[PDB]
Paper text:
We therefore used the co-ordinates from a high-resolution crystal structure determination of the full-length cAMP bound CAP homodimer to construct an ENM for the apoprotein as well as single and double ligand bound holoprotein states. The thermodynamic parameters for wild-type CAP demonstrated an overall favourable entropy change and unfavourable enthalpy change on binding the second molecule of cAMP consistent with a previous report. A previous study of the truncated CAP ligand-binding domain demonstrated that binding of the second molecule of cAMP was entropically unfavoured. The difference in thermodynamics between our experiments and previous experiments using the ligand-binding domain alone is therefore likely due to the contribution of motions of the DNA binding domain. The closest distance between the two cAMP molecules in the CAP dimer is 9.5 Å (the distance between the N6 atoms of the adenine ring). The extent of negative cooperativity in CAP is generally small (ΔΔG = 0.3 kcal mol−1). The allostery observed is unlikely to have microheterogeneity as an alternative explanation as all CAP proteins crystallised as a single superimposable structure.
Residue numbers in the entry:
A (entry chain A): 9 to 208
B (entry chain B): 10 to 209
C-alpha cells in the first residue's frame, strides 16, 4: 500500500528480540504499534500468574490500539515477541493527525479491531460451550492450517508445546498430556514431544 | 451535533421488546445506532442455550463488525431487551460520512475497543474461574456499572438469576443456589427483590 507506506513514514521503527515484552498490561497507553516483521502473542494472567493466550498477531497487524480512543487508559494485556520482531511505533497524537489527513488508515486499523472482536467472541463461545477435549481438538486443527504447518504423509505436522496448548485452551500442561494421549489412542494424531501430526 | 448530523442520514425504526434485530449468519450490509432502548448481544450453543456477550444501550452502534470487509455474516444475534428506537444506515453511506468527519468512525471504533476489552476479560474469566468465581465476578462487574445504585451495604444492582446464568454460562437454578451460598458467606444480599454486593 501507498497508504501503509505513508503511514509507516511517520513512524519510528524498532527491533525486539524473541521473547521480549513489547507491551505490559497496566502501562499507560499513548502509542500505537504495527508489526513490520515477526509475530507476537497477546497474553493475560490469573491471580496466580497462569497465562492465557488471547491471540497471535503477525506481520501487518496493529498492536496497542485499544487505548487510542479515550485518554488515560491502560494497556489491556501483555504482548510478547514469539520471534524477533520489527515494529513501527507512533504516538496516538500523531496518528490522530494522520486519521484527519486520510481516514483510510483508521479504516485499516478498525478492520482489524472488528476481526479481533469476532474471533475473541468465538473464543468465548468455545470456552463456554466446549469441553477441554473439544477445545484441544479444535486448537490442533487450527494450528494444522497455519502457514507454519509442515505437510506430512498422514496430514499436517505442527510444532507446539503442551504448555502452549494449555495457555490457549485454558488448562494445565498435565491435562493437555492426558488429552493428547487420548487423541493418539483414537488414531486422530501422533505426538512426538513438541511435534504433533494431525491426521487429515 | 456530530450525532445530530449522522442521524439525519439514517432511517429510524422501532423494535418492540424481545424482537430480534440482527440474526447470526445474515448478510451484513447495514449499520445500526441505538437512539433509545437496550439490547442484548447473544450467541448460542448446539443445544440452543444462549450466552449474553454484551448489553448495549442508547448511543451504541450495532452491526458494525461487517463494515470493513464485504461479504461477511452477522457474528451474533442482537435482541431488544426493552423496546428500541434504532437508526439504520447502509455501510456505503456510512463510509461516505467517514470522509466528511472521521470522528463518527472514532466513536464507533472506541466502542469496538471497549467491547474487545470486555470480551477479552470474559475469555480470562472462563479460562481461570470456576462457576462460583464467574458468578462473583459478574456481580462485581454489575456493581461497577453506572446504573448500579449506592446502598448502605454496597452497590445494589438489578439483574435476574436467569440473566446471570446467560452471562456466566450456567442454568438459572445453578445461579440461585450459588447466590444463596454467597449471601451465607456474607458477600452479598440476594434474599430481597434486588442484589446488593458488599464492599462494592
Ligand atoms: N482479544 C484480543 N485480540 C487481539 N489482540 C488483543 C486482544 N486483547 C488485546 N489485544 C492487543 O493487546 C494490546 C494490549 O495493549 P492495548 O490494550 O493498548 O491494545 C491491545 C491490543 O493490541
Ligand atoms: N484453568 C487453568 N488451569 C491450569 N492452567 C491454566 C488454566 N488456564 C490457563 N492456564 C495456563 O496454561 C498453562 C499450561 O502449562 P502449565 O500447566 O505449566 O501452566 C498453565 C497455565 O499457565
Ligand atoms: N463481544 C461482543 N461485544 C459487543 N457486541 C458484539 C460482540 N460480538 C458481536 N457484537 C455485536 O453484535 C453484532 C452482530 O452483527 P455484526 O457482526 O454485524 O455486528 C455485531 C456487534 O454490533
Amino acid at each position: 500500500d501507498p497508504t501503509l507506506e505513508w503511514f509507516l513514514s511517520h513512524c519510528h521503527i524498532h527491533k525486539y528480540p524473541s521473547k521480549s515484552t513489547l507491551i505490559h498490561q497496566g502501562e499507560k497507553a499513548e502509542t500505537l504499534y504495527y508489526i513490520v516483521k515477526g509475530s507476537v502473542a497477546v497474553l493475560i494472567k490469573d491471580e496466580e500468574g497462569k497465562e492465557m493466550i488471547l491471540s497471535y498477531l503477525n506481520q501487518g497487524d496493529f498492536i496497542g490500539e485499544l487505548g487510542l480512543f479515550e485518554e488515560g487508559q491502560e494497556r489491556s494485556a501483555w504482548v510478547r515477541a514469539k520471534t524477533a520482531c520489527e515494529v513501527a511505533e507512533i504516538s496516538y497524537k500523531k496518528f490522530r493527525q494522520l486519521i484527519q489527513v486520510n481516514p483510510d488508515i483508521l479504516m485499516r486499523l478498525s478492520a482489524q479491531m472488528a476481526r479481533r472482536l469476532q474471533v475473541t467472541s468465538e473464543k468465548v463461545g468455545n470456552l463456554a460451550f466446549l469441553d477441554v477435549t473439544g477445545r484441544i481438538a479444535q486448537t490442533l486443527l487450527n494450528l494444522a492450517k497455519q502457514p507454519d504447518a509442515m505437510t506430512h504423509p498422514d496430514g499436517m505436522q505442527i510444532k507446539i508445546t503442551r504448555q502452549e496448548i494449555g495457555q490457549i485452551v485454558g488448562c494445565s500442561r498435565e491435562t493437555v498430556g492426558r488429552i493428547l494421549k487420548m487423541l493418539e489412542d483414537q488414531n486422530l494424531i501422533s505426538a512426538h514431544g513438541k511435534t504433533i501430526v494431525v491426521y487429515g
